[PDB]
Symmetry: D3
Subunit: 309 residues, 6 copies
């Protein structure tokens, strides 16, 4: 079986970058809409006996992109692909991972069930909002981390990184920032709201680096940055793997004191970058390409958790 | 267990009509979108031990509405509803019911699988594009027919119906028109394309009635009507259960010779009716309400196949 | 994994032809009946790690043959075959593919479920009565077409084929005849019953060729042929992939005006050919052998939809 | 939900007896064959919301009857029956319950899987060949025993039963005979083959009673009876729940020394009784009717293991 | 269907308390071990058609108790119980809810799968370690909260509760303490380790109340209490729903400065209470009994999230 | 894919012997207990794309070992092993293979379901208590036999084996002893209890060899040996594949007249051998190693049923 990479319509540039890193052309697929807006999918080449990877991020018109992904998986499965892998850099509905007191769906579990029944044998994703989502599946799920690329960016872009501070915006994700601070051998200052915020960790005259899994409306990072600037930090950075930037996010970032808002390209960023000068993108296509290549070859994927390829 | 009717966002007016016919209020549900356009669903009342019916048609923004339906089903299922029934008047992706020579998905089967894995115990739908779709499910599926309401409309609106002709637009659905002609005791003239059309059945100086399951772009019925008017029919009617009317449909209908284009209200029609004077709507809410009531009470549903309630 | 071909008891000659075309011997299997008429199956050679193909058509004693097929699949699956494929040239219960108004089983879906639970990983079949049956499965289904062999027969056996007409007997299957007429570049005359029949398409002084998926009691083709001979066709042919010929079929064919009734050998025909001189058989063993070989080698199967091997 | 009893074609008289004991009429069902010998099933009354019991024994044309049962279950399940129970007095393929050294199917497990996928929620059967077959299902299985009726027959028909001996024909089923002997407070003599047979237990000048689950070819009981008559037993009886009597069974029984061969009516016996004067039938319709009634009412079924109703 | 409560061997006193609150006797069940230490289960009364609740906490010999629970569920399911509910006050393997960088099982998901395949239709549990565990199931899961009982205890046992502080021991569970502080209208001071600890929130001359889901080795609460006593808190309390208290826990509690260590009785505490004077128990049997009663009657369970019955 | 052998904690020496025979090192795995006695499993090497075999016998602390096996299977499955095989020399809960009149679990079926849902693709076991257990699975199960090794031991250790007698202790397993006697060409004397025992087959002045699948409390073999010594057998041997030896077994063996009690090493025997001088062990690691090697290479496993490797 050979690797076949197919792109959904959500993130074409990322799929092309992945395909170039693998020395492959993107598989021929027609992904459009019928007149009544139903998804139309046509696999333009035989996938019989091949190892198929479908790249689609949970961004943009999320329900359309998710339906397209499921329809593509189904088309490849009934076309006798030997294995079908969904490469989902940003997992849709990941924030609906529990009920907790409300008569609400667990939408992430529903998405996992739909991916399974569509025929996915394997999932590759990056920085799941909650790693318990891996347990929503019965098929293997490789949850990659942007952390090696983030560490590389910090070392090559922040001159005072040895004295900086790594700040979690909410108490929930402080595990990520502790791992990053341990890797950099720095202090991890913490922030949480009580309309007021409380911060532990000396930030005065230092650089503070907010790290989080995603920025949707940027309410979380803007409040944290306001707090940090209250406590005398010389500069504040925000680093996120998923740059969703919906709603009022671009205006809030423009009016905030961030030196830089760095995101990975798990979601296309060109349109947002046009309207916001302080957004910078870390390419993670090498990590995804290496994960695809290693799953195909039976090589260790977890080696990527700590190594930039 | 009591009947609880919940409406999705696709067809609120139909759900309200159904609820009024059952003497019930619509269940409290919040169905909206998060900032990043992910579906947000919140069941506003306990459904524990209840017989839940969720009304959502495959129309409008089809992928959003389908996701909303699946999320609502999941929310009701994990909220310990005794039974969950999807009331889907127009089944989405019904026209993708086979591959036939192409490397294509069977999207209708995927939709059936998704509805099943979401937790639906029962499906109620109207005039499935292909009744083989019933076999795509392992749960019971009640496929209702608009034919009794169509016959009622014909008898009360076409003065010359005893001399009229019932015409199938494509060879595929001529079964429907034969059943209708047998019920009315009239001739069924047939039409199919060879850019030219061929018609069997005397239509001269008579009324011809085109009957079909749906009109999407109205290419099918406009070509058939052109043929019929070539052969001297005094008036031509089109009657359809599903009035999708996407793309150039309204302009084609406006420029065509139809005396009337009658559709059921399985899909909301007010916006289309604003731009097209010859569209008339048959209310089928009584049929859906009776089906819901009979499934709840253990009464015969097939009795509705031949009786207007 | 190597190809292993096993024959059920239904069509031994077809299985042998397939095995010869693949350069293989039929696998050792004992398929008989216990005293109380329960099916007895004994796999006479190890199939561990092999790619197993079981050839059984839905003909003869259909329930016995279907049980035998399921039992063989189960025996091969629990004997650790790497993959089990049911090669079912004529799919049993294919005509019970829907309910449509009656309190009836969808027997084709039940058969698909039984094949799946027995352990079949893949289905190869020819000219399914309804291609929606492919959606009754969750495993891949390769639905082969007799059309290339039919076109070859027409070109090599009917001297006036460039002027002939391709006639559908019922409105349902006219898609097949349109494809054939497009391939031959001829007119497709159509027939359907109203005890009287209506025909469109000049057949006078021409050869008419009825094409259909199967002839069971031959009521369908005999009525169509009577109509065609009413309209002056010089000769009438019938061509079918599945020659079931049950009940009064042989007598009706003998008393009908067919120049020839051509069937494929998806069903054994020698006994019927003894009693009916106008039955001729097209061998489709090359198509089935090529499909088996291509699925085994990961080669394109759809290439066979348009090419005679 | 009300009880609905449907009969398959295998054992109509038993189904009628069961229905009379329940004070019910048999449900309207058409169970016949199409021209090509495919099973045709038509449920003649609504079963929506009802508790459906389908009576079909694994006898006669076993594969036809099994297919008919599965098709009926499927028809009732997709007709929205609240619960479907297969009442299978003699379970087909029960003797193929293991492989043991051979490359053979476990056909009983396949049958269980097929019954489950057809939609059966519950199985009622009598004297399974191996009670481990209950573990082949994931749905509940009530395995009834003919033993109370057998004990009643022994007490009312064998004058010397207090001095008799209960003999197992093969070592496998001696558990049944020990239970019977314990109930009667008598000795259980045992027999097994070494073309010679060995017997333990004084049988001289006594009545010996062979007890077994079934008599198929009667090779087992005729050999055992020959042995018993060698050792001076005044009379020999055979008692079996399942009287299959296939092959040479009737001739062997006619030429054997049995005083009586008693069977239950889990299988119709009239035709066999015509050709064999020493066959007598125990009616077990009361046990099956009580089991149906108790499962419907939520009453203890195991109470029937020791009580004649 | 009637309620039947069965106790596993893990927590007999809790099951008895639940049964008394429901006005029921515990169902007759034999739960012991064979000589080779395999679990032996015997249901001593018919459960046919009943609503069965099996009470077993994930404590003590956890693997034995989990096996016993699964075996009991299986026994009740194949005995035709109408519904089987696992009442698991402390969910076993809840802390293995993710992999996160290691080649480790997701044991909680495995436990959920095992409970589902054993036949559980419903799960009732209290204070799941991660509420995402609800998404590990496809059956409904009611995750009850000890918070109402905790609030009642605080108000009736701590005289200065209006001035107290609610402290989370680890950053992960601070959601619980924020909910509790909001209910009490007090400040929530937070603690996390950097062998040193950092605390935000004035605790000087006040009572601090540590709240957490469980105390296993009490390393978490003892370190937090040491920190709190460093910052001048007059008294420190610990309140936990699950008092596992394994390993060195009792000695650490005895040597720590806790005024009180309060636990619920989701786990039996008498043996631990013998060796530790500062352990007090909150009875939560009323909450579990109300949940059982409300699920049985189709009443709202979420009403218990905020109301002490 | 390469073979990876992992050992559970139950039988480390057997796993090492198997690994040596395959020329492999045991895979790195940490299998221990958390403080609260929950199983902790950590796979110390990548198994991605490998053929994983996990060796764990149903002995010792059976519930702990079974949980450990399931957790290891789950860890390997979600770590993307190409195939996972449970090598279970002594299958736990095998004696609970049926209900038979009691409201009891079928625990063996539950264990099979748990192994399947954990992710096992294949089971290798030795001398299942009932071979019907193979039908409890839907995955392939290779049930190996100790008989070739037993025959080898008999020929090399009992000088009078040509005149010996092979005795079944209970009527149930006499099939094993008939196969052994046929292989050795000797008589098979049989024993069963009526507190008294009955024996057929001349044993006077001969060696009697009891053969059975397992000895748990040794009540079965000690009673049989007492009977045999009553009838003048010069020596009595017992040979068993599974030496469980729980409860009073060692004392009964010490006080019994056995010349030797031979067991295989499907269960560790060193501790029991310390306290009982007449226990001897047959190594079956070559049979298990050959089965693993042959399943990996696609070679015939059934060849081992009659051949010592
Ligand atoms: N796409 C979405 N956009 C915004 N909010 C969402 C979205 N999906 C779910 N939510 C809601 O957001 C909330 C989840 O918030 P969040 O993940 O930030 O915190 P948490 O899960 O409570 O805690 P933490 O992640 O810190 O452990 C829920 O109320 C959920 O319904
Ligand atoms: N939403 C859609 N809008 C338009 N075309 C669609 C849609 N979904 C599927 N199709 C395409 O339309 C075609 C199906 O057309 P249609 O149902 O009219 O005819 P058919 O299935 O070939 O025959 P018939 O229904 O007459 O038996 C397929 O090529 C399918 O891919
Ligand atoms: N083996 C069989 N022999 C005869 N009739 C059968 C068989 N199996 C099913 N039928 C019946 O035949 C009918 C199906 O007929 P047929 O397939 O010719 O037409 P259709 O499905 O209505 O339309 P079309 O195939 O033209 O789209 C149904 O009433 C079905 O119950
Ligand atoms: N319908 C059938 N008629 C005859 N033989 C059958 C039938 N089905 C299976 N068999 C075969 O009969 C044998 C099973 O025989 P039987 O049930 O009498 O003994 P057993 O299972 O070996 O032992 P026991 O039942 O005494 O414990 C197997 O070889 C099986 O393949
Ligand atoms: N029974 C157990 N006893 C002790 N440790 C366990 C047990 N089960 C799992 N663990 C381990 O404990 C760790 C989980 O710790 P914990 O739940 O306290 O923190 P977390 O999940 O990392 O974060 P948080 O719960 O604060 O969001 C994992 O390494 C897991 O393997
Ligand atoms: N681990 C165990 N230890 C002891 N007894 C057990 C164990 N598991 C199950 N049992 C019980 O042992 C009995 C099964 O006994 P056994 O297997 O010796 O005979 P059988 O199945 O009745 O007949 P046979 O195996 O001779 O055909 C059942 O009552 C079962 O509940
Ligand atoms: Mg967050
Ligand atoms: Mg159409
Ligand atoms: Mg046809
Ligand atoms: Mg048997
Ligand atoms: Mg027998
Ligand atoms: Mg914690
Ligand atoms: Mg046993
Ligand atoms: Mg035994």
């Amino acid at each position: 079986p050979n690797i076949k990479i197919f792109s959904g319509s959500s993130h074409q540039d990322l799929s092309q970058k992945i395909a170039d890193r693998l020395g492959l052309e993107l598989g021929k697929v027609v992904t459009k809409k019928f007149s009544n807006q139903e998804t139309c999918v046509e696999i333009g080449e035989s996938v019989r006996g091949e190892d198929v990877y479908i790249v689609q991020s949970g961004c943009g018109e999320i329900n359309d992109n998710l339906m397209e992904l499921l329809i593509m998986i189904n088309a490849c499965k009934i076309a006798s692909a030997s294995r079908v892998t969904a490469v989902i850099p940003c997992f849709p509905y990941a924030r609906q991972d529990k009920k907790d007191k409300s008569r609400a769906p667990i939408s992430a579990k529903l998405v996992a069930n739909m991916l399974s029944v569509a025929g996915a044998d394997h999932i590759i994703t990056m920085d799941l909002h909650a790693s318990q989502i891996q347990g929503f599946f019965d098929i293997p799920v490789d949850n990659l981390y942007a952390e090696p690329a983030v560490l590389k960016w910090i070392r090559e872009n922040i001159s005072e990184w040895r004295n900086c501070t790594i700040v979690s915006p909410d108490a929930g994700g402080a595990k990520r920032v502790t791992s990053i601070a341990d890797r950099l051998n720095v202090d991890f200052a913490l922030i949480h709201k009580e309309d007021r915020m409380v911060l532990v960790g000396d930030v005065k005259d230092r650089v503070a680096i907010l790290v989080d899994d995603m920025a949707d409306t940027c309410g979380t990072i803007c409040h944290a940055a306001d707090k940090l600037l209250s406590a005398g930090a010389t500069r504040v950075y925000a680093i996120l793997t998923h740059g969703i930037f919906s709603g009022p996010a671009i205006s809030r970032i423009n009016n905030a004191c961030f030196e830089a808002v760095v995101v990975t390209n798990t979601i296309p960023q060109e349109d947002k970058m046009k309207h916001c000068s302080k957004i910078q993108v870390i390419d993670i296509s090498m990590i995804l390409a290496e994960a695809i290549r290693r799953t195909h070859n039976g090589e260790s994927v977890s080696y990527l958790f700590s190594h930039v390829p």
